[PDB]
Design a protein around this ligand. Structure first.
Ligand SMILES: O=C(O)c1cc(C(=O)O)c2c(n1)C(=O)C(=O)c1cc(C(=O)O)[nH]c1-2
Ligand SMILES: O=C(O)c1cc(C(=O)O)c2c(n1)C(=O)C(=O)c1cc(C(=O)O)[nH]c1-2
Ligand SMILES: OC[C@H]1O[C@@H](O)[C@H](O)[C@@H](O)[C@@H]1O
Ligand SMILES: OC[C@H]1O[C@@H](O)[C@H](O)[C@@H](O)[C@@H]1O
Ligand SMILES: [Ca+2]
Ligand SMILES: [Ca+2]
Ligand SMILES: [Ca+2]
Ligand SMILES: [Ca+2]
Ligand SMILES: [Ca+2]
Ligand SMILES: [Ca+2]
Lengths: 446, 444
């Protein structure tokens, strides 16, 4: 899709909803879920805390704090994945993923907890999968349980080929040899959607990549922070792209989503793959022109020159631009990146309506934006096979929306906002003054 | 997708198949089917003839000639739609569409015939749907019977907003009023996928548009000459775009495929909608630069400015380019268009494999190209939800490929070629010298 203008974003205020801030100053609130007890449960990435909030009173209880969660002030690491067992009433388990120190500097671990109703706390931790890659950038970490009773987990590309990890070789396209696999060497588990048994083992029916069946379900991902099943069993996803081409994807077994060789469509438009890990020397700068313009010494491959297989294009890009696009626009001052044609999608939620469903929201996907301060509504057809029209911005504000859910009746939305960061103002200019720092906000349909 | 180069087409010779011309004297062969009798049936668009060919021997019989078929030498009209009833043994009907004079100058008519095996001919014609738009351009006309036992028919935009119909207002986005339906006025039946009952009536479960349920199933199409159901009931389609953005689409009930406001993706790249019907200068010329550059006077709408509803993007474009693209390529001397970043897909065929299935052709869609002289192989995932990778060209030749099918076994392909027309040679130049004019060719 084509980028919206600052003016089109600005007018998306959603006057049809009543806003009520339930909590503020949470410490990097990250994920929220409608609980099996009909209470709002949410995580604090920074502290490892799992909070349960009473929707009516806003009353908060710190149900549990995951011990030894490692978090960097300037990183996207910490407590990430969070889900309940689908049949909680009979299988009182909570699944999480987190950044922990790797004895063998960090690792990501997927772990199960048992919820104790009588003591109201989490207990009996079991590490399902440990030794996973870890870094300060592009961790992803969305964790869901599918209709097939498997764990689906997004693990980002770790930030390789940009910023502080500029010269590390991106592994989004790499998959394990049986040897690595036998040694539980999961270094290729970057830029992937993993599928695992509820006990952490490899599903016998997982896709085969280069002759090996591992935890990988799909590959070629950058930073997929949104993952949600539809009522008919399909898997929708949102993913952060570089300077362009954030994506909405449909996740299909064994698919290759192209990163980093391809961003968005295979269109050679507005992006090219500059592999700094192959650059002549580690002294060259990243011009930050999305590979369209690069410094001498770095090998660039067009999306059309890539030779990978099973490439699956996105359903929708936010956004795609042409080679002439200016990635250095002097409107976002020293925070140029905020003016890039992206929306920085932080999650992905399948709206399921209910007895008070919101008019016209059937088969929609809600996708919160960090840098634009809106929540997008994206319509699909009734079979969730295609999108209809464009991503509609809602709830415009000077906030970084991090996650969103709806109440069972469907007439109330609950959203989380970031504690700090940059957001685009009504006039396209950049601000780090967030209206609702680290909040739990409720939007009630009038 | 990004355009291949002359050299990339040139190299798609498919030295792994054996070519053998089965028939070569055809006059504008258009559609070909694998018949319920295990013979190959094909049509001649200009003559209205329906031929049957023995796949083994190559013996051919003219089973019937549809009477009073109208065809302009310079046109795409004639006998178009052609399908068999799915339960032929018990319902020996053949469904066609054809250009006929309109007493009330032409109209398109969807008609049924009954097959008589003892006399081996067609009879008892029944007009299912008449009074459909007709013109010399963009007729489309693919006719298929779905798993729901309904007729699905593609009807083009009639060429409006280009060439001889430049100043006519494109109706791809228009739908009928309940008053037009009641009156059997089907003028809005342009640039659509229609869905009809086997008797021509309106299916009670068809989609509703602007308040009315008509034969329209989907709208916003240019020239969709390809239509094929997959084994799991999905509807794949191919469609001719203008100077760019030919499409592979997945047809979903009530979808809007964007034409003419949007070509390919809604990306504002390489196309814009210049509405000549709205220009004040009937004097205005078409610069033929795909809306990127136009003469003064004609109103232009960007893809991103369109206020459409239910817009469904293509699965794949052949091809998409940027605004810096030059639509005036010298390599193609006089026939500049041939060098345009399109492939001109004339059909769409779902490869069903079989006992001798071509290795790795599982879940593929075959798309013949007129202007490039290839057959593209397009891979989809096993649920026919997404494409995998790109369109792989095959059988490069100086021929205009018009249709393609496979034998039940899956190891032989049958293709039709045009009698005449321009085709891109191995090195980019255009030639009107076709290697196998109007033939039925088999690739083993
Ligand atoms: O392209 C951008 O302008 C932009 C902005 C942001 C952001 O505002 O945080 C992120 C990203 N990109 C991005 O690619 C990304 O992976 C990302 C992750 C996060 C996050 O806070 O977890 N923000 C962003
Ligand atoms: O863009 C092109 O270069 C190009 C070429 C051709 C062609 O070769 O005839 C057709 C088209 N476009 C086209 O848009 C189109 O609708 C069309 C129909 C036919 C036909 O012969 O039935 N050719 C073409
Ligand atoms: O450079 C723009 C943004 O790019 C993202 O890939 C990084 O994770 C963010 O830290 C950064 O602010
Ligand atoms: O102009 C290029 C081609 O464009 C198509 O839209 C027309 O149907 C063909 O007759 C024409 O040759
Ligand atoms: Ca980004
Ligand atoms: Ca991708
Ligand atoms: Ca791209
Ligand atoms: Ca064309
Ligand atoms: Ca279209
Ligand atoms: Ca377009």
């Amino acid at each position: 899709d084509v980028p919206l203008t600052p003016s089109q974003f600005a007018k998306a205020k959603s006057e049809n909803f009543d806003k009520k801030v339930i909590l503020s100053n949470l410490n990097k609130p990250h994920a929220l879920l409608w609980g099996p007890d009909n209470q709002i449960w949410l995580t604090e990435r920074a502290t490892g805390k799992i909070l349960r909030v009473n929707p009516e009173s806003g009353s908060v209880k710190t149900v549990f704090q995951v011990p030894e969660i490692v978090n960097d002030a300037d990183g996207q690491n910490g407590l990430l994945g969070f889900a309940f067992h689908p049949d909680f009433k009979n299988n009182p388990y909570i699944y999480i993923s987190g950044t922990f120190k790797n004895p063998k500097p960090n690792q990501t671990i997927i772990r199960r907890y048992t919820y104790n109703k009588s003591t109201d706390t989490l207990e009996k931790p079991v590490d399902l999968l440990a030794g996973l890659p870890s870094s300060k950038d592009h961790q992803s970490g969305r964790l869901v349980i599918g209709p097939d009773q498997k764990i689906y987990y997004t693990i980002g590309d770790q930030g390789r080929n940009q910023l502080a990890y500029l010269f590390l070789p991106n592994q989004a396209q790499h998959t394990p040899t049986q040897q690595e696999l036998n040694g539980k060497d999961y270094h290729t588990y970057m830029g992937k959607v993993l599928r695992l048994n509820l006990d952490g083992s490899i599903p016998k029916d997982n896709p085969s990549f280069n002759g090996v069946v591992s935890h990988i379900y799909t590959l070629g991902h950058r930073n997929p922070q949104g993952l949600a099943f539809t009522p008919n069993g399909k898997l929708l996803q949102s993913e952060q792209g570089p300077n362009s081409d954030d994506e909405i994807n449909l996740i299909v077994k064994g698919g290759n989503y192209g990163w980093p060789n391809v961003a968005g469509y295979k269109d050679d438009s507005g992006y090219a793959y500059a592999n700094y890990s192959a650059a002549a020397n580690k002294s060259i700068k990243d011009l930050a022109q999305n590979g369209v313009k690069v410094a001498a010494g770095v090998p660039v491959t067009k999306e059309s020159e890539w030779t990978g297989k099973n490439f699956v294009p996105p359903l929708k890009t936010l956004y795609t631009v042409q080679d002439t696009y200016n990635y250095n626009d002097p409107t976002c001052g020293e925070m140029t990146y905020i003016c890039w044609p992206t929306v920085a999608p932080s999650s992905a939620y399948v709206y399921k309506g209910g007895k008070k469903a919101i008019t016209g929201w059937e088969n929609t996907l809600l996708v919160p934006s960090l840098k634009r301060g809106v929540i997008f509504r994206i319509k699909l057809d009734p079979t969730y096979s295609t999108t209809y029209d464009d991503a509609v911005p809602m709830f415009k504000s000077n906030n970084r929306y991090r996650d969103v859910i709806a109440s069972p009746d469907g007439n109330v939305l609950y959203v989380l906002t970031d504690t700090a960061g940059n957001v685009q103002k009504d006039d396209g200019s950049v601000t780090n003054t967030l209206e609702n720092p680290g909040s739990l906000i409720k939007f009630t349909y009038k």
